Design a protein around this ligand. Structure first.
Ligand code: HEM
Ligand code: HEM
Ligand code: A1BT5
Ligand code: A1BT5
Ligand code: H4B
Ligand code: H4B
Ligand code: ZN
Lengths: 412, 412
């Protein structure tokens, strides 16, 4: 009941007792491990108060007033508010704590050494899609900070009945369009071909190119969503060049600077925040490996290998591996030369080991998802490959949720 | 109870019902996933017969005579033999079936598309360490087959009381020595520094160099183990050259051709085979990535990057990644040019997807360990990165076991 994780490169051993406070379930049983399944698995007033109490007992414990007067009155205050409304409202401090610890608790995030340096924007007074656009625009401007990126989260009103939900229908605030073709090929980003078309249905006028920044589809208080174009001056992009190969400019690639996830759900004290877009900065491999080289994404290994004059006849010439390394040198170089924040997989995975040591020491553990923490190239030459990790669900947390277009009681 | 695994690059979905026949436990619970822990977790006559029956019910089912006369008589025959001796003996056919399915069932092995082409050598008549040397020598000769490698397993007598065990104390039949230094550095292979010294204690005369093939320490029928030198003519090695960089010869590296694991335990029908060395061929990344570039192994990224004239000042120049790809191009090229069998991570991971489709179709599933199946470089540009896998323990199986020097009632 007091488990041990080992690093097999350093022989360092850590003891996890934090998993005892774990509540949710993982998908694994004693007879089957599901640690490589991508997505594993109304709210009544009965269930609500224990979730509120559990959250408030760790909030007040955290500020060194566990069980004090203010704790008991706040516990009774929330209990009384859940009697009257069968829900409740977080104090501003409780909202900032909740958000930072949802990030702290995200076992799939290698960036978490920053978890406490997070700027929380309280958008709970928002009522319309236009107000969402405004709040989201100010999030982008602040987070980008002229390339010196800053982590931030914007939190729209919590779910109530369920049919009144705030949702951002984009997967990321900033995301390139994807259009199919007559010959069945795909221009832009094949990830977003369905969403790109959805914007066209609600009325987008698409400039059918490669790197066309999608509009925002914003749904407020359960109403039908509404399209808005982020002003291009707020959309910072980085043209990708190589520090050796000058044909790399001719590739004419580019990516946006600010990764900002917008389709997830934030749980705090049993309250559900269906619209909570959050942003930090990129680890280089996300762009150079997955975005650029996934077969079902931009899929550019073909062209880069050609221009490098590689032996592409055989699998075993490792031409794919060789062109993958050049591409990620190029992403990093281009971002850095522009003073736009980015971290390479070596620095980020090292920081995550250091972060792990902090969490085990001053918190008794750090939930971690090896399948997601290990980067998608050069796995074993990063220290996290050799680090055993225990995965488990702690709350507050970021959860997946269905896409709004599959659940929204459409209204035409 | 009828689970679904998805490939997120091909959108292919498979249905696993094979996990229902799973027996052993994984280490995971409903509240904690341990899929990245390296090693998770006498035998009485009471427990023995169900294990025998379970094995015999699937053996006879496999040859299309489930429940026939021969099945029932064999079930009674084994029951009667477990009454008299509280153990039993496998028929030769049952031994070959068991071994092939232990391999078939090995969720950490990406090579399993070959699982039925396995040469089983019955060494159960062996009684002395000299006989073990002889059997092991014939295994090496056969498996190597002039570079056209062939999978094989040699099976020494099963454990009985426990204090009479056959063990091979080497981790692999062929393995390079590791010696420390006055300045605390290490020559050869740091993995085997303890075992290298153990051979020196029992009497080895070490040629203190880099790539010195260790002697065999062979323990028969519980007696103290005995040293034997494999004749060098049976030890096929491959000098590593690069197809472009001619300084790569000056690196003067080499590896042995035949990977032959010797420290594992084979369970068949409740019977334990403590000495069962098995051999196939290498996936290139095992040598070029782990053996050569693990920090606690040969650790050569330093020198290869130097001779490539790389910017080693910064982490983010990705010089480590760049020199890692060259090194694995070199391992593959050198093995192939010599007609010594080897598979590159791209071909091997593709074959494992194809194998997965076969197992789900004609068997209802394929237990698979994503943490181990995904290769240690270029992860997401192989199809197994994008393949969800269910892990679970089926029997017959290969299990870990303590090193004999930590358990053997030593006798001096
Ligand atoms: C500040 C720098 C950050 C870095 C370098 C970073 C890095 C990463 C990476 C590489 C992933 C894997 C994503 C993928 O492969 O699709 C990830 C996942 C994730 N990150 Fe972090 N992140 C950062 C900030 C944040 C912030 C500020 C939050 C929340 C407020 C956050 C929450 C998450 C969550 C919830 C996931 C899991 C998403 C999923 O399960 O699909 N991250 N992060
Ligand atoms: C024929 C070509 C084969 C290939 C290409 C292959 C490939 C691999 C690789 C790359 C690993 C990971 C090893 C590591 O990273 O330490 C592995 C593990 C394993 N292989 Fe296969 N293998 C082959 C044949 C076999 C055979 C013939 C057997 C048994 C008779 C076998 C049984 C296993 C087992 C039990 C493991 C897990 C070892 C562990 O858990 O540490 N393999 N294989
Ligand atoms: N459609 C598919 N399914 C699919 C389903 C779910 C997902 C989940 C993808 N999470 C995107 C994500 C999440 C968190 C952080 C980042 N990155 C960052 N650095 C930051 C962003 N904000 C602050 S930091 C990116 C992805 C794909 C697929 C098709 N082919 C392969 S997957
Ligand atoms: N000492 C350490 N612990 C440690 C504990 C356990 C282990 C287990 C390592 N299995 C070695 C192995 C197993 C199966 C197949 C192959 N390869 C093949 N292709 C074949 C061989 N035969 C037929 S195919 C190699 C490894 C290390 C470490 C220190 N640093 C990092 S690990
Ligand atoms: C099938 C598999 O679980 C899927 O590819 C996962 C693997 N690990 C990952 N790791 C990260 N960071 N991001 C991903 O999208 C995935 N995908
Ligand atoms: C900590 C972690 O489980 C350990 O590095 C595992 C990861 N995956 C692996 N995968 C393979 N094939 N071989 C290994 O030795 C390991 N080591
Ligand atoms: Zn698990």
């Amino acid at each position: 009941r007091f488990l041990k994780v080992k690093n097999w490169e350093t022989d360092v051993v850590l003891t996890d007792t934090l998993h005892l406070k774990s509540t949710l379930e993982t998908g694994c049983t004693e007879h089957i491990c599901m640690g490589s399944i991508m997505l594993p698995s109304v709210a009544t007033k009965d269930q609500l108060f224990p979730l509120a109490k559990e959250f408030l007992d760790q909030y007040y414990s955290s500020i060194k007033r566990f069980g004090s007067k203010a704790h008991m009155d706040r516990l009774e205050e929330v209990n009384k508010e859940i009697e009257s409304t069968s829900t409740y409202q977080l104090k501003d401090t409780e909202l900032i704590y909740g958000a930072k610890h949802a990030w702290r608790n995200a076992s799939r995030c290698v960036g978490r050494i920053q978890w406490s340096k997070l700027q929380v924007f309280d958008a709970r007074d928002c009522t319309t899609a236009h107000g969402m656009f405004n709040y989201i625009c100010n999030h982008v401007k602040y987070a980008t900070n002229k390339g010196n990126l800053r982590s931030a989260i914007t939190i729209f009103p919590q779910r109530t009945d369920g049919k009144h939900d705030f949702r951002v229908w984009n997967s990321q605030l900033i995301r390139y369009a994807g259009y199919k073709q007559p010959d069945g090929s795909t221009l832009g980003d094949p990830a977003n071909v369905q969403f790109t078309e959805i914007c066209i249905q609600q009325g987008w006028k698409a400039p059918r190119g490669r790197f066309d920044v999608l509009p925002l589809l914003l749904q407020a208080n359960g109403n039908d969503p509404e399209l808005f174009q982020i002003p291009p001056e707020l959309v910072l992009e980085v043209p990708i060049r190589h520090p050796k190969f000058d044909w790399f400019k001719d590739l004419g690639l580019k990516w946006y600077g600010l990764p900002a996830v917008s389709n997830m759900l934030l749980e705090i004290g049993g309250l559900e925040f269906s619209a909570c877009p959050f942003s930090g900065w990129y680890m280089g491999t996300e762009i150079g490996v997955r975005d650029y080289c996934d077969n079902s994404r931009y899929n550019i290994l073909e062209e880069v290998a050609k221009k490098m004059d590689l032996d592409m006849r055989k699998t075993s010439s490792l031409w794919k591996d060789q062109a993958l390394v050049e591409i990620n040198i190029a992403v990093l170089y281009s971002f850095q030369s522009d003073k736009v924040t980015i971290v390479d997989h070596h620095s980020a995975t090292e920081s995550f080991i250091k972060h792990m040591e902090n969490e085990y020491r001053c918190r008794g553990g750090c939930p971690a998802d090896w399948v997601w923490i290990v980067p998608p190239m050069s796995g074993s030459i990063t220290p996290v490959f050799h680090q055993e990790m225990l995965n488990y669900r702690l709350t507050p947390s970021f959860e997946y949720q269905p896409d709004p277009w599959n659940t929204h009681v459409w209204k035409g």
